Amino acid sequence: DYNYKKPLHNDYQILDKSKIFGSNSGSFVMYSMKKDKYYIYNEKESRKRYSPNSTYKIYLAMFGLDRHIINDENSRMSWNHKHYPFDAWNKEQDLNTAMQNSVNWYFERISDQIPKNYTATQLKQLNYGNKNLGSYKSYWMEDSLKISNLEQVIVFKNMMEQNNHFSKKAKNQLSSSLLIKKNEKYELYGKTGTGIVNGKYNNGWFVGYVITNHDKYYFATHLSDGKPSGKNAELISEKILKEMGVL
């Protein structure tokens, strides 16, 4: 019920990206590693907490790797033969296929193997939003757990960049699963999220990072109105990153 209030002790730039957002409402946040600087479109809104829905698969994947539920030799999980609505979900998966095709059951299976105590300790160490696990059952799916767009960037950057307990091998395997585009100029990584309530999209995300020859940027777009889908959050992120000369 409370939003993100911790102040930023960094160089900061206010952005005007309303033309790219068009009819869609939300916020955009980017962090430059080299400059130690935040760039934010709609800063008050960037601090409003929302369910992370599928961006939380980034963390379920890191936790699954840290607890050795999945590893670099075997991240394969069997399909249980239940009919899912998306054909890409109706088959055996590994980490890369599950992440790419946002296969909910794969991450739910990892979550069922993780003790609440471990998850609470990690969310505390990561300062993950409201750290609210609720009933601890699909808590990241439009439920108790909430995080702001600004925190999505701070939290991800810190998980990946801090000198912490997650192994280099786990970070590498997670990164590989998140790669979307690679060309001569950059590598773009990221994860979409889409929520639906009462037949209407209501919570869209695209969380990621870009590695260029000059810098590394962490970023996130959140959409709450208009056509708030993860696919639209991704398109908006790509347009903003190209407009700022990152891509």
Q: How far apart are CA 6 and CA 151, in angstroms?
A: 10
Q: How far apart are CA 239 and CA 233, in angstroms?
A: 10
The answer to whether residue 181 forms part of the interface with its own copies (CB under 8 A) is yes
Shortest distance, CB of residue 9 to ligand CAZ, whole angstroms?
31
Shortest distance, CB of residue 169 to ligand CAZ, whole angstroms?
25
The answer to whether residue 104 forms part of the interface with ligand CAZ (CB under 6 A) is yes
The pairing of strands 147-148 and 186-197 is: unpaired
Burial class (CB in 10 A: 0-12, 13-18, 19+), 64: buried
Q: How far apart are CA 196 and CA 37, in angstroms?
A: 33
Shortest distance, CB of residue 208 to ligand CAZ, whole angstroms?
12
Chosen from ligand CAZ, its own copies, none, partner binding at 211 (C-beta under 5 to 8 Å by type): none
* Interacting residue with its own copies among 2, 7, 23, 73 (CB under 8 A): 73
* Interacting residue with ligand CAZ among 188, 230, 237, 246 (CB under 6 A): 230
What is the chain's length?
247
Annotated active-site residue 54? The verdict is yes
Q: How far apart are CA 113 and CA 111, in angstroms?
A: 5
Chosen from ligand CAZ, its own copies, none, partner binding at 168 (C-beta under 5 to 8 Å by type): its own copies
The residues annotated with a catalytic role in the active site are 54
